[PDB]
Design a binder for this molecule. Structure first.
Ligand SMILES: CCNc1nc2ccc(C3=C(C(=O)O)CCC3)cc2s1
Length: 166
């Protein structure tokens, strides 16, 4: 958990303009969060990037988890290996509001972070899930009580988030 270059937004939420794969490789945190779907198919966005950085080891492990346990629920999570990126990966399913999943479930999704004292994470339901990223940061601040280090790849989005918050 050798985090550096973060800006503290609240007592427990930190933010950085960084690629989450590069942060994970540098810091080797105890927990990296994946923005997953219910079948843990890591095809694009942050999930595709983390899986590619494990050279598809995350996808083979995820398929075995699904074969034995079934899919996750929207707002749910599971803990799997973090491979070369972290001790553990917490796979969390935010709602896909573009497909009619309820935005109320974004609070349930962020509640999974509270089971871990320190996490490196992306914003949930941003990107192809369709939630407004600034609303997702507000839900993170209002819900997460443990220490979360958020990595935002896009500089234009990062500047917008820091301006709306601090
Ligand atoms: C080059 C490998 N690293 C990465 N590939 C991506 C792809 C998408 C993203 C996304 C967001 C983010 O900053 O969390 C919000 C919307 C999609 C981030 C990354 S880091």
């Amino acid at each position: 958990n050798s985090f550096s270059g973060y800006l503290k937004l609240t007592d427990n939420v930190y933010i950085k303009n960084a690629d989450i794969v590069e942060e994970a490789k540098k810091v080797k945190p105890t927990v990296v969060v994946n923005a997953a779907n219910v079948y843990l198919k890591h095809g694009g966005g942050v999930a595709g990037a983390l899986n590619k950085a494990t050279n598809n080891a995350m996808q083979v492990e995820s398929d075995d988890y699904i074969a034995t346990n079934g899919p996750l629920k929207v707002g749910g999570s599971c803990v799997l290996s973090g491979h070369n990126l972290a001790k553990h990966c917490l796979h969390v399913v935010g709602p896909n509001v573009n497909k009619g999943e309820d935005i109320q479930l974004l609070k349930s999704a962020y509640e999974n972070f509270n089971q871990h004292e320190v996490l490196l994470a992306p914003l949930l339901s941003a990107g192809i899930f369709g939630a407004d990223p600034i609303h997702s940061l507000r839900v993170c601040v209002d819900t997460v009580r443990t220490n979360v280090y958020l990595a935002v790849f896009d500089k234009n989005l990062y500047d917008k988030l820091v301006s709306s918050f601090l």
